[PDB]
Amino acid sequence: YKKPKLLYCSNGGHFLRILPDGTVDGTRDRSDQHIQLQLSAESVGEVYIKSTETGQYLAMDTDGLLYGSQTPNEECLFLERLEENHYNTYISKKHAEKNWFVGLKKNGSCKRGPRTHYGQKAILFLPLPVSSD
């Protein structure tokens, strides 16, 4: 039942609540339909994050800062990777050259590109999407 794909990171009740405005935060609520994105593998390993039926399309600001609203620029193309820690990893191929892979702040928002390496664990997102099992 491919639908609202919920994604978040860092132990603790906090979900990625996207808003048409662009300022997406880690809202810890599931009452208002604003914490769901249409995550899917567009190309071989290339997954896109688009909150179609709820918000807007993502468009990272040079990886450094994560945002979305206007258009799903290539910045929004990430390589789907999995870690043996019950978490999902997405490499922003657009900036993979600098070893940068999408990282958000559970209690801040998605914008930690200059710190997206083997230090900030927030990169290991925990997905709760309605798969087709």
């Binding site: 070893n99 200059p114 710190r115 390496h117 083997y118 230090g119």
Partner: protein, 98 residues
């Protein structure tokens, strides 16, 4: 390249190195601090401990001393030292010596 198994006290020296490592791999070269890696480090991780984020350049000059301006893998380390003593040692270093 990097670390298999360590010890109890080896973890706590790692955790700070891991901070170092995710800040120095910014412009060039993760093995050396560069000066929009260093200043970003003092301004973010050391804004309270090191109450001199505007005079980094002096610390840098004092640190670097080969002055290649790669804050090297033990030039840099000194900084953690200066914070380490700072908690005990408000200002009271002086020294002057060739």
């Amino acid at each position: 390249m990097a670390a298999e198994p360590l010890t109890e006290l080896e973890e706590s020296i790692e955790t700070v190195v891991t901070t170092f490592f995710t800040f120095a791999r910014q412009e060039g070269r993760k093995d050396s601090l560069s000066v929009n890696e260093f200043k970003e480090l003092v301004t973010q991780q050391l804004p309270h401990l090191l109450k001199d984020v505007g005079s980094l350049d002096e610390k840098m000059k004092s640190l670097d001393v080969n002055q290649d301006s790669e804050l090297k893998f033990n030039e840099y380390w000194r900084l953690i030292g200066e914070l380490a003593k700072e908690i005990r040692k408000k200002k009271d270093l002086x020294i002057r010596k060739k």
